[PDB]
Structure formats: C-alpha cells, structure tokens
C-alpha cells in the first residue's frame, strides 16, 4: 500500500526540513549536486510496510487549479505551524478549510504538527495546540526538525489516521 502525504503550513514553519529529516536523516545543509532529492520512503508502521510519497508544498499560497489537483491526490495532511509563530498557528484553521474544500469532505485524515520545539522562543503553548487538535478530533504531535524529535511519529501517526478512513 502506497500513501500520499501532503505537508502544509505557513511560510518558514519547517515543512521542507521535516520532509528532509524523514527521508534523509539530517538537518544541516548537505552539498550533493550528483543526486536529485527524494520524496519517497519505504517504512514499516505497526507491523505493516508502506511506501510514502510526500508533497512538500510551498509556503507561498495562491489560486491554482493544478495545485488543487496536486493536493486532491493527497490522502492525509500534516498541518504544520511553528511554536515560535503565533500567526502560523492561527493560520491552521484556514489550512484545514482549504483541505476540506479541495477534498469535498469534512472527513479527511489530518495531524497537527507544532514544529521548532527545540527553540528558546516559544510563543504557542502545548496545551493551546492540544485543544485546537481536540476541537478538530485529530492528533497533535510536537516536533523539531533540528533534533529529529517527533518527526517519525508525525508522519506515522498520519498514516495511522489514513488506516482508520
């Protein structure tokens, strides 16, 4: 089984760094012009193998019928905010509504991710994010693409949400 995962959220919240931690297991820039960067990973989750394709969306938002179609191909969505960016957190409602629109359903597998949890500059509190997530009936995971904390769990937990659809 294949899973199409889509990572969304506001500019600079760490969408690419999360994807890059998942697939490549590092945070510092590497230099390698020989290789194309990969968006596919084979993993075992709860004793069953799967192939994951990750759409790591641009933060810069716009109207696009083709982008809607790229997102429509997604089966589950990580909605990512950064714990030091209150606006990214307030944006999550808008990202949830956009996914509901594109998918034409209220029942879309989704996980809330609060990234950059290694930072000294927290402005959004765990409890606050837990409540939004509970309000939506979806799981909540805090992550750091720097240290890799939560990174597996975020994508794997989304897969778990797809398996219950």
């Amino acid at each position: 089984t294949e899973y199409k995962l889509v990572v969304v959220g506001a500019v600079g919240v760490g969408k690419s760094a999360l994807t890059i931690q998942l697939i490549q297991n590092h945070f510092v820039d590497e230099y390698d012009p020989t290789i194309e960067d990969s968006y596919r990973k084979q993993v075992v989750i709860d004793g069953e193998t799967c192939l994951l394709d990750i759409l790591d969306t641009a933060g810069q938002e716009e109207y696009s019928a083709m982008r809607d179609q790229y997102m429509r191909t997604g089966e589950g969505f990580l909605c990512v905010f950064a714990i030091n960016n209150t606006k990214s957190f307030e944006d999550i409602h808008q990202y949830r509504e956009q996914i509901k629109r594109v998918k034409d359903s209220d029942d879309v597998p989704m996980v809330l991710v609060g990234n950059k949890c290694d930072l000294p500059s927290r402005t959004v509190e765990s409890r606050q994010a837990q409540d939004l997530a509970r309000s939506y009936g979806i799981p909540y995971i805090e992550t750091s693409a720097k240290t890799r904390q939560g990174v597996e769990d975020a994508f794997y937990t989304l897969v778990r949400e797809i398996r219950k659809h």
């Binding site: 394709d53 083709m66 790229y70």
Partner: peptide, 29 residues
C-alpha cells in the same frame, strides 16, 4: 525539474520520479 526516468526504468523508478514531479509541478505554479 526532475530528469526523465528512462526506458529501462522499473515501476519503483517511476514512482520515485512521480513523487519528484508532484513536488516540482506544485512548486512552480
């Protein structure tokens, strides 16, 4: 822009290419 996968390409080679194309086409809209 990802390089075309080739005529020797396995099904798995094509999935890898596809996931790349997906990200590319989204990014350049």
């Amino acid at each position: 822009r990802p390089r075309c996968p080739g005529d020797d390409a396995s099904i798995e080679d094509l999935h890898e290419y596809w996931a790349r194309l997906w990200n590319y086409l989204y990014a350049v809209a």
